[PDB]
Structures are given as C-alpha cells and as structure tokens.
Design a protein around this ligand. Structure first.
Ligand SMILES: *C/C=C1/C(=C/C2=NC(=C\c3[nH]c(/C=C4\NC(=O)C(C=C)=C4C)c(C)c3CCC(=O)O)/C(CCC(=O)O)=C2C)NC(=O)C1C
Ligand SMILES: *C/C=C1/C(=C/C2=NC(=C\c3[nH]c(/C=C4\NC(=O)C(C=C)=C4C)c(C)c3CCC(=O)O)/C(CCC(=O)O)=C2C)NC(=O)C1C
Lengths: 490, 490
C-alpha cells in the first residue's frame, strides 16, 4: 500500500515493475547467468517459458553476449542502438552494472535519426545566449519545436526545496503554469536523488499496464535496484497526478549546476509518447550542454552584480571625502543603496532618527526593530526572511515588510542601514487560470496543481524572498566601506 | 611535565600562572565572592593575607565593585582605563565573564595616550591601499614606527596550516625571516583556537618569573580557564623558542578574514616590553580595520582574476569562429592559456600528439600521464599538488613538474590541456642567512627558526603550490568554453 501519509518515504528505486515500451533482463556481475527478467521478455524477444537459471549465452546467443561483455568496459549506462539477436530481430539496448548486478533493457530498434546532428543544431541555438533569462526562455520554445511535446516547462528549485515555473512553451488550448510555485514535498528526497543520478527520465504512458519483474525478491531477500534503469516504473502517486492534469506521457531533463540539482526541463504530452534511444541520446547531450552554459552565465551574473556594487561604493567614498558632515550625506543618499541589494524598501537609523524610502515598517514600529537589531547584530550583518519569527509584533505589517537585512554603519554608535522586502505572495506574477479545476482520483484533490499552489502559498505566509549569498557578500562589503569612512570622520 | 612529545596536546588555556606585569582576581558569576587570586595581589593592590572566601566589596570596596558590575552589561573583555581603588591607587582594569566565572585583571594605570587618535592616524595610512601586497608591505613598516618594536612580521597560513613570512620590518643588525616557512606543528590547534578568540596576545618578558593562581584547582576539581585573560602565562615550549631567538617580548595581532584565521601580525622585542591598556586598545582597533580592508582587497583580486579569464576566453572563442581547423588553432595558441592559471609550464595532448611549453615532464613520460588522466578524469577537471603520490614514476622529474591540473577540451575524444608547477622548494625567494645559528636549551635544537624551516622543507618535498579555489573555478570555465566550441566543429 502507498498513500499521501507515507509517499515521502516511498522506495521508488525498487518498484519491482517496468514500463511496457521495453523488456528487462538482469544477470550476475560477470553476465554468465540470468537472475531475473520482465514477464514481457516472452512477447518482445519471442522466447518460451522461464528465463531464470538459464545462462546468458543460451537465452541471447554467443554472438550478442560477447559484444555486451566488451561494452561494460563506471555506473553510466552504455547505449547500443540497433543490435541483432539470434533470429535477426533488431533491438536498441541499454546496458549498465549497479550493486554487482548487470541490467539489460531492450526496445524495438529505430535507425532513422542521427544523435550528434540533432544535438549540434539545438546546442548551436543556445551557445550564444548572453543572459540566464535569454537561455531559459529560448530553451522551452526550442525543445518543444524539436521533440514536439504539447508542453515544455523549466522548474527552478528555491533554497527551501520548492519549485518555481520560470519558463513555459505550450499548445494554446492548455492552461499556463508560468510563475506558479510547487512545495518541496511534491518531489520527495529519494526522487531528487534519482534525478541527480540519471540525466533523462521517461514515462511512455501514465495509463499503461506495468510489467512485473520475476522474481520481485530473490533467495537472499533482495529487491532489484532499478535506479539507473530507464524502464523503471513510476510511483502511483505521480501517476494519478499526471492523470488528473490530463498528461499521458512525460520526459524530464536534469539541470546540474556546481554539482547540485538546479532544476528540471520537463516535457508533458496529452497522448502516449516514447522517444527512440537515438533521440534520447541527443536530448541527454543537449541537457548536459544547457547545464554547462547556465553555470557560466550564473557565474558571469554574480561577477557583474558584485562589480557594480564595488563601483557604486567607490562613487560614494569619493563623495564622502569632499563632504564635511557624513550624517548629512547619508540622509541625502541612503535611498541610492537600494541599487546594491534587491529590496522593496530601504531605511536609515542614525542618531536615534529614522528616514524611510519605499515599503518600510510604520514609523512607530522602527524603535522596537532598532533596539532588537542592536541586541542580535554584534557589529555584523544580520538578515531574516521571516521577521515575525524574530518579533511576533511584526506580523501586523508583513504585507509591507516580512524580511529585513541590517548593515552597521558605525563601529562605535548603534547606527544601521535597513533593507526590507514584502512577503513573497505580494510580488507574484502568476500567469495561471483560477477558474480551471482538475478531476481527482482515489487519493483526493491533493494531487492537483491548484492544491499544490495553495499548500505552497500557506507555507511561505509572512515570509519574504530569502537573502542570497550574493546579497550577503555585497552587504558585508558595504559594512566595511561605511564603518571605514565613519571612523575617518571623527 | 611538558616536552616535544606532548606539546601539541598542551592545555595552554589552563596554565594556572599569570605574567608578572599585572595581578588577577577571579570572582563568582554575580561578582559577590572572591574564588581565586594571583599571589602578587598582595604587592600591587597592597592587601594582607588570603583573599579567597572574603567578599568582593570587602577586598576592593563598595565604590569600585558597583562600577565593575555595571560594566559587565557578551564574552569580549570590558576595558576600564584609570580606575581608583580604596586608598586612591590608579589601575587599568580588564573585566570579562567566561564559564560563569568573573575574571578581573589589574595593571598600573597610564593616562598619557588617546586610543581613538593613535588608531585613526594608523588606519588612515592603510585605508587607501589598492592591492593586498601594498597593504601587507606598508603595515609592518607602519606598526614598527608606531609601537617601536625591534621586529614586526606578518605570517600568512597556507592550506596545510604552515606559515609563510610575507612581510618584515626589523632593526638592520637582526637576521631576516622574509620568505621563510614554518610547519603547522609550530602553532598547535589549541593555540590557533585562542588566537581566533583574542585579537591581541602580549608576552611582557619571556625570562619573567610567572605568578601562580591560588588555588590552581578548586573544591570541585576545576582549573581556572584563562582563555580571554590577557595575563594568561605562555607555554614553556614557546618561552624557550623566543629565548633561543634572542626575543624577550612579543605582541601578536590576529588577522580574521571570512571568519577564518588568515594569519598574524607579530611584534618581537629583544628587551622586555609591556604596552599600556590604551596603546593595546588602539592596536586592537587597527588589527580589526587591517583585517576588514584585506578581506575587501582579496575579494577585488578574485573578481579581477576571473574577469581577466572570461575576457581571454572570449578573445579565443572569437578566433575559433574565423578559423576552420580548431586543432591547428589549439597547437598555435595553447601557450597563451598560461596567462589564465599561474603555472611554470603548460602542454597540449591532442590526437595522441604532445606539444609542451615551459617546465613540463619529459616527452617520453607524457603517454603514461595522458592514459592516467583519462582513467581518473571522468570528463571533469582533475588536479594534484603531489604528482608522485598518484604516479610513483613521476618522482624522477618532480623538480620540473610536481603538480598537474588537467582540463578536458573534448566531450568525445580524450584530449587534455595540462598545466604544471615545479616542486615548491624550487620557487623559494628566501631572504634569510644560513650562517646564522641559534643557542639551544634543555629541549634541543627543534626550537630554532633554522630547524623549523628544515622540517617544513622535508614536509613539502616532491610537492607543488596547491591549486587554489580560484584556479579550479577558472579551469572549470575554460573546460565549458573548449568542450563547447569543440562540439560546434564537427
Ligand atoms: C507525496 C508524494 C508526492 C509526489 C511524489 C513524486 N513526485 C514525483 C515527480 C514530480 N512531481 C511534480 C510536481 C509537479 N509537476 C508539475 O508539472 C506540477 C505543476 C504544474 C507539479 C506540482 C513534478 C513536476 C515531478 C517531476 C516530473 C514531472 O514534472 O512530470 C515523483 C517521481 C518519482 C519517480 O521517479 O517515479 C514522485 C515519486 N508528488 C506529489 O505531488 C506528492 C504529494
Ligand atoms: C610543539 C609545540 C610547539 C610550539 C607551541 C606553541 N607555539 C606558539 C606560538 C608560536 N610559535 C611560532 C613559531 C615561530 N615564530 C617565529 O617568529 C618563527 C620564526 C621566525 C617561528 C617558527 C609563532 C610565530 C608563534 C606565535 C607567536 C610569535 O610568533 O611570537 C604557542 C603559543 C601558546 C600561547 O598562547 O601561550 C605555542 C603553545 N611552538 C613550536 O615551535 C612547537 C614545536
């Protein structure tokens, strides 16, 4: 049994079933003996009776088995498009070895597509992108046009595991998910772990009858680990989700940046759809190249951001020299620091006087905040995205200021520069349709995009967009700049 | 007993003695009762008999004890220059609370120096430094001229804990330590931990008679933790070291960068020397400001380095477009990649052909390296500073190439770009005098700069300067640039 109470702990790596668009044979470490096989090995390979106990050379043939052994020579599956069996039948074969068990996946052959050629055309069109936004927007559009899926999304993972739809290409009749968030629980930890091990992940048919593996558990009480198997069957929880959405097929591409799961390129189809091995090889290479280019562009953006901050602080220090009263200069210019760190408001607390700009807490609320900041600051940068978790009184003005970053501007006195952010739900640019409802199944209305979005909204209430490492790094450079020049003027 | 066999595990935080230039009183959490006191409390404060058991108000006076209580209101010692006792005697007082024990340190008062004024003059002269090198070189010279110590050094800690003398200002007659390294064991872990907790550390007299604390251990079997006490006595191992060097006094300033111990500003004097509390306050503030400015300058240098790499790779990709044969371009231009990553040599391994530039392994040795690199690389950047630890055959050419960083330039073929570094002892710029020998003590010749340097040299044999995070980050950006354009040309 699997339900909404235990689906976060579901062992999705050992389902004991495969998808019907191919058949599976498991063999021993040295591919001599057949240990397990899929029920549908009978139909596709055209063999009689049980395969378990019989040798690899007996069941496949000496000719083929020799080539498979040679291909094994670390955990990445070997692709063998268009191999011939004994009778002559052509099959595309995926061969890998994990937990000293050799797995062999067969699907009907397709020799009418060139992987390198398809991939090169796609990678050329993204190679010359000069911004993250430009790469992201063009990629959904490009992948849709090339692989002909009804909908292509890019999800980006937030710090808290939540996913944001940052790009979309779809059929006009389908509803938009652009700007929508899903909760971390919508992709369990064991799913993120598999997504990090396999570039590609295919679901040919959400309504397809799953084929069992024989045996499901062997003599020593072990299940067959299908972590690296492309035929591994999908969770019935995700199955019902796709069925509820009207999605029949899917193919996800993992986006890996600084050896972390940045997000997914995900393709939905409203009818069943299996890509042939050669097309899957091209899509995988594209995914690998998309990941590398995004990594460099993220690196370039970080450098430009912090370079612009250094330039701005130099401009200010040049002014600070020619001007006699530094307090006077800060009062005139504090709003200009909003250019350094993304914020919805910024304020100056100097000589027990408050000056606000943009969305700040109310004038009467500032003294409490100032005294609190002085308490916990200890002459260093202090920052929260959940202001009411620190000061329960702050809940009342969360719609204006739910997040705060404090910069000390004096080594001696308790003067601060306060950056503010509105609660994250305020700044939403959701392009979806609230009138669109979804058909539910046995499990309930939890497995609908509508309910996923409502659960996320509840989780991030009274909270702002978290302060990034780049935000922190700029705040620290501004502290040293202001504390420094404040010391000089005394 | 303490000797060279257990001095790495020495509990230097609980010595049970203090330096004679002040007296110590320990009291209970709420400074009511006197729990411990230094033997010399009798002489300096002019009091009769045992102090333990007597109240704080009885021994110091209601007037003074009130001001001490008020000053406590987290672990940083409170400075109280020129406080009066009962009879009128003037004392400079350092007050702190650690492990729910209040410690009170007394030294004869000095009210003929302004902390802020001294510190401001010093901090002005370093504020406008535009390079790490410029800040480092001027600071030794400046600190010497201001605090009048015979020698000022800056040690910078390497990745392996070793220390390098990166700057020096000294009397002409003294021997130079500039460019010399010391081993990690020369500053134990518990010493680095204390150096990270206290900005300043003073030794008034290496030949001074240490004053015992009474009792050394109390009723419950606890020693007095003097971690934050400026009067805490020094290890006899370090004592003998300074005596062997001809050093009588020392004062070290901790350099803290990204919340790590970057190194020390260290001042040696050949005669005894105690700085008054006001001068120590100025030196501490200077240390704090020196640390902040070095942090920003390190950040600026990292940005400039990686910016210059991006510019260089853009120049190359612009050339790669106009040129038809990419292999031909790489053969002509590979030496130019030496500008990206600091190296003593660079080579190109393309189509099983080798092209070398600078200090590379011999021509006959390259095929072995190439096959090895292909083995462990797995299409990612691979780097070592100890090449012979990976390939014992490589020991023979360590003087030319002891370190290697490999960059794959093809997704498909096993082509690499190899950066090399000579073994670290080759590239030494040691400004010391090998004729200068040192007087040893009971412990042996281990406690001499000569033997410290010889031990370090032995530890880094057959090893190169480690590849930095910045070196790695540039190598990764170059991989994506070369793998990318290599794909386009097919
Ligand atoms: C309690 C367990 C649940 C669960 C498990 C589960 N989710 C998996 C994949 C997956 N889930 C989502 C969520 C969404 N996809 C969308 O397109 C939208 C909205 C438009 C949502 C909210 C996504 C995106 C994915 C990735 C695949 C895809 O997007 O098509 C898996 C994968 C397991 C496997 O590899 O077999 C598991 C398991 N999902 C739940 O919602 C819940 C509650
Ligand atoms: C086995 C234990 C040893 C040891 C312990 C120890 N060292 C400490 C401080 C310290 N040691 C050095 C080493 C040098 N200083 C130099 O100037 C030179 C060469 C020119 C060397 C090699 C240094 C620099 C320092 C810091 C202070 C200073 O430089 O003056 C301490 C401090 C403990 C305390 O806080 O009381 C301990 C303990 N030192 C050894 O050499 C060895 C073997």
């Amino acid at each position: 049994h699997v339900d909404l109470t235990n689906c976060d702990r579901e062992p999705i790596h050992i389902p004991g079933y495969i998808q019907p668009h191919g058949c599976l044979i498991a063999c021993d470490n040295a591919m001599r003996m057949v240990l397990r096989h899929s029920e549908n090995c009978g139909e596709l390979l055209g063999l009689e009776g049980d395969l378990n106990g019989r040798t690899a050379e007996d069941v496949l043939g000496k000719r083929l088995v020799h080539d498979l052994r040679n291909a094994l020579t670390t955990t990445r599956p070997a692709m063998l498009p268009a191999m011939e069996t004994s009778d002559g039948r052509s099959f595309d074969i995926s061969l890998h070895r994990y937990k000293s068990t050799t797995i062999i996946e067969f699907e009907p052959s397709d020799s009418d597509t060139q992987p390198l050629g398809t991939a090169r055309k796609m990678v050329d069109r993204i190679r010359e992108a000069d911004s993250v936004e430009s790469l992201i927007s063009r990629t959904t559009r490009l992948v849709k046009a090339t692989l002909g899926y009804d909908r292509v999304l890019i999800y980006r993972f937030e710090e808290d595991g939540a996913g944001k739809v940052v790009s979309e290409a779809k059929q006009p009749e389908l509803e938009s998910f652009l700007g929508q968030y899903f909760p971390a629980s919508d992709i369990p930890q064991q799913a993120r772990a598999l997504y990090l091990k396999n570039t590609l992940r295919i679901i040919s048919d959400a309504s397809g009858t799953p084929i069992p593996v024989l045996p499901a558990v062997d003599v020593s009480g072990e299940p067959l680990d299908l972590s690296y198997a492309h035929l591994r069957n999908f969770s019935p929880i995700h199955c019902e989700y796709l069925r509820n959405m009207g999605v029949a097929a899917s193919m996800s591409i993992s986006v890996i940046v600084d050896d972390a799961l940045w997000g997914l390129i995900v393709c939905h189809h409203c009818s069943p759809r299996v890509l042939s091995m050669p097309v899957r090889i091209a899509a995988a290479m594209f995914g690998e190249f998309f990941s590398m280019f995004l990594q460099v562009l993220k690196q370039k953006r970080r450098l430009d951001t912090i370079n612009h901050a250094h330039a701005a602080l130099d401009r200010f220090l040049r002014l600070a020299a020619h001007r006699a009263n530094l307090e006077e200069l800060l009062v005139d210019s504090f709003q200009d620091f909003a250019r350094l760190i993304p914020c919805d408001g910024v304020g100056l607390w100097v000589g027990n006087n408050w000056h606000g700009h943009g969305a700040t807490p109310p004038h009467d609320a500032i003294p409490r905040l100032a005294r609190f900041v002085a308490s916990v600051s200890e002459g260093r940068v202090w920052a929260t995205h959940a202001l009411s978790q620190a000061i329960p009184e702050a809940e009342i003005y969360a719609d204006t200021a739910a997040g705060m970053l404090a910069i000390p501007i004096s080594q001696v006195k308790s003067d601060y520069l306060l950056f503010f952010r509105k609660e994250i739900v305020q700044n939403l640019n959701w392009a979806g349709n609230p009138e669109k409802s979804y058909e539910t199944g046995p499990m309930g209305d939890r497995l609908t995009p509508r309910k996923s979005f409502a659960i996320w909204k509840e989780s991030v209430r009274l909270q702002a967009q978290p302060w990034s490492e780049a935000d922190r790094e700029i705040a620290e450079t501004a502290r040293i700049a202001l504390v420094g020049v404040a010391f000089h003027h005394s």
